[PDB]
Design an enzyme around this catalytic site. Structure first.
Site, PDB file in Angstrom:
ATOM      1  N   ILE A 182       0.810  -1.212   0.000  1.00 43.30           N
ATOM      2  CA  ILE A 182       0.000   0.000   0.000  1.00 43.30           C
ATOM      3  C   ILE A 182       0.855   1.279   0.000  1.00 43.30           C
ATOM      4  O   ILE A 182       0.490   2.260  -0.648  1.00 43.30           O
ATOM      5  CB  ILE A 182      -0.993   0.016   1.197  1.00 43.30           C
ATOM      6  CG1 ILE A 182      -2.088   1.058   0.965  1.00 43.30           C
ATOM      7  CG2 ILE A 182      -0.280   0.238   2.527  1.00 43.30           C
ATOM      8  CD1 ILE A 182      -2.865   0.839  -0.315  1.00 43.30           C
ATOM      9  N   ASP A 183       1.997   1.258   0.686  1.00 43.98           N
ATOM     10  CA  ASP A 183       2.863   2.434   0.765  1.00 43.98           C
ATOM     11  C   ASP A 183       4.236   2.049   1.354  1.00 43.98           C
ATOM     12  O   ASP A 183       4.414   0.912   1.789  1.00 43.98           O
ATOM     13  CB  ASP A 183       2.168   3.543   1.581  1.00 43.98           C
ATOM     14  CG  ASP A 183       2.199   3.297   3.076  1.00 43.98           C
ATOM     15  OD1 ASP A 183       2.276   2.129   3.505  1.00 43.98           O
ATOM     16  OD2 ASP A 183       2.133   4.295   3.828  1.00 43.98           O
ATOM     17  N   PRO A 184       5.219   2.975   1.343  1.00 37.69           N
ATOM     18  CA  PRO A 184       6.538   2.613   1.881  1.00 37.69           C
ATOM     19  C   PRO A 184       6.538   2.221   3.359  1.00 37.69           C
ATOM     20  O   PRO A 184       5.544   2.448   4.053  1.00 37.69           O
ATOM     21  CB  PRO A 184       7.361   3.891   1.679  1.00 37.69           C
ATOM     22  CG  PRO A 184       6.697   4.603   0.568  1.00 37.69           C
ATOM     23  CD  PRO A 184       5.240   4.308   0.707  1.00 37.69           C
TER      24      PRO A 184
END
Lengths: 219, 218
Positions: A68-70
């Site tokens: 979904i994201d870092p």
């Protein structure tokens, strides 16, 4: 096969491979709209590493592995990468591939060095230490980039059932989208997830070469 | 095991307990569109629209899905062929025959196979016209398929062209494969590996395989 465009804010210069060309104009436009906002937060990764994954070719890719994201901290720009091999997510992904391939002795694992695979973060940054905190800034860019990726890959593998609970899969498309358990979830569940094997079955069904997941290991 | 009323034909919808969390919106959505939908002669008849809702879902791990009913003599049971003349079920039976080794048979029904629910994405068409009621079933179709994919482990769609514009919030849990339509005359369905691969996918998801031979009628 490399090019370069400029955005009005940091990182100013964005390098990209030819395969990303059809998207780069809307990207520059969209990023110029939100950059001043998100840059006031300290981020993972740093601005100079936001877009480094755009250096990758796409035509030789047939599988996208998407988070979904870092990482909340210490992101490198390369999704799931942990240089000192400490982040739980990549360690669990490695354990799964370890049981799968029989590779027991390894120093690390990186999804980015596997032929046919492009690892991807849906959002390209987060406020330091806060998961999904930059969703509102990356929203339009995130749809733009992922849609472009799925024009090339045959399988989209998303990690995190809650994170991707509302992803609209296109059936016919020529792209199969599967959503598995997050590697850093709970009650194992990811450990017993056989998504990596499923991907290869799907690829071979579609008459594509399978993924050699052992290529991710670092020795 | 249940029943709800709707304003137009078939006026009543019988359903199994597993379909409960969906029936509220289904009635609402159907009342919106039924009026226009019913001005045409339909395949199947209005009283056969929803008969697949009588099926349990908790015991299903594979959904076999077509885009909409056959333009003539639809029964409400997708892919069902009484006298066994429809090219679809014949090509399917032929594929299953090679897979199972069953040589002698007089028919095949996908709806009598443990763990399998045959489904039509759109639940009707105008008599003699393929894919003609897409605009009426759209909302309903998304709702019903999303519910099914809360239960099944594999979704098998037949017809690449037919499903090319369909989007779905699968969630899960669900591995999707989309194959060539069995009745395609430019294709050789005998070369299709979809049915064979389903049991591989089920094994990878730690489920029991499908016994496709249960489909045969002797």
């Amino acid at each position: 096969h490399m090019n370069s465009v400029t955005v009005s804010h940091a990182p100013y210069t964005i390098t990209y491979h030819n395969d990303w060309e059809p998207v780069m104009s809307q990207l520059v436009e969209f990023y110029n709209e939100v950059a001043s906002w998100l840059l006031r937060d300290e981020t993972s990764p740093i601005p100079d590493k936001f877009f480094i994954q755009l250096k990758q070719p796409l035509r030789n890719k047939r599988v996208c592995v998407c988070g979904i994201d870092p990482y909340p901290k210490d992101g490198t720009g390369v999704p799931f990468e942990s240089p000192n091999f400490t982040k739980k997510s990549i360690k669990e992904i490695a354990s799964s591939i370890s049981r799968l391939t029989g590779v027991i002795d390894y120093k690390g694992y990186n999804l980015n060095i596997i032929d046919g695979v492009i690892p991807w973060n849906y959002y390209l940054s987060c406020k330091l230490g806060e998961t999904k905190s930059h969703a509102i800034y990356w929203d339009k860019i995130s749809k733009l980039l992922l849609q472009h990726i799925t024009k090339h890959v045959s399988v989209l593998y998303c990690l995190g059932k809650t994170d991707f609970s509302n992803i609209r899969a296109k059936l016919g498309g020529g792209v199969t989208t599967i959503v598995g358990y997050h590697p850093a979830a709970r009650d194992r569940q990811f450990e017993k997830d056989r998504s990596f094997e499923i991907i290869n079955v799907l690829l071979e069904l579609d008459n594509k070469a399978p993924i050699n997941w052992a290529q991710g290991f670092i020795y």
